[PDB]
Write a protein that binds this ligand. Sequence first.
Ligand SMILES: CCN1Cc2c(ccc(F)c2C#N)O[C@@H](C)CNC(=O)c2c(N)nn3ccc1nc23
Length: 264
Amino acid sequence: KDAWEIPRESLRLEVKLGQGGEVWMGTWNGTTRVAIKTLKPGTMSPEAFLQEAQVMKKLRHEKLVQLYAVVSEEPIYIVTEYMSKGSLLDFLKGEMGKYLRLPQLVDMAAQIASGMAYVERMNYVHRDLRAANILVGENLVCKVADFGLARLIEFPIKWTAPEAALYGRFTIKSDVWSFGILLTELTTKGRVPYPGMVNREVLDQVERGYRMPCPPECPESLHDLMCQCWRKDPEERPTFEYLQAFLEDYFTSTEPQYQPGENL
Ligand SMILES: CCN1Cc2c(ccc(F)c2C#N)O[C@@H](C)CNC(=O)c2c(N)nn3ccc1nc23
């Protein structure tokens, strides 16, 4: 057992924030607001449930959801930090959605690209990168999460690169693709990529060279970044280090003459 092993009674689960096990907002050692991901026995394999905690032990970054502790004895628990604003998907679709603008939305994208550039230096792949897996706290802080499929190197189709959805080639540039889809989520405020298309139709058109057009009120200089994320050859895609640098200097180097619109 590791040093992440805490007593099974040191947690006081309270409010459930969504379930599938479930997700609870509770207490740790008396005073720590935490988020407790739990394994509700569906007789699910705990080695397949602690695999999400195995990767979360080696990844520490200010833009990643910080694991707090693990309970590896049935029933299984996973304790992480509590994000006060919930998932980014619900945030873009919630009441704050209509008020978000391009300066704030690009900032959230630079935080995601910062945390996605961290694990790019650690030689890991996330494999389920999407706004439904990004979590928001106060001050518009976005930490990527849901490492239940992340693993060290050696489907939700609409977010996956073709070579990963087709040939299982989940690499550092297969998530760069999902980042470009994440940029369409942020620019449309939570809308589903490829409107009106089913998973099979997306797989057919993406393999035929089809790419999503420019979101309304989105600058072509940002949709160009999405196309670079959606390049067929995985090595043509930009690094997350370039992605984080691009989005941090966006309104000085790329769009210095940005004027706000009704939506962006
Ligand atoms: C225990 C880990 N998870 C589960 C989780 C989600 C939603 C998206 C995610 F990428 C993750 C992850 N990884 O759970 C959703 C069902 C609901 N969870 C929350 O609204 C939440 C929150 N407000 N802070 N916070 C912190 C952690 C946390 N979930 C939350």
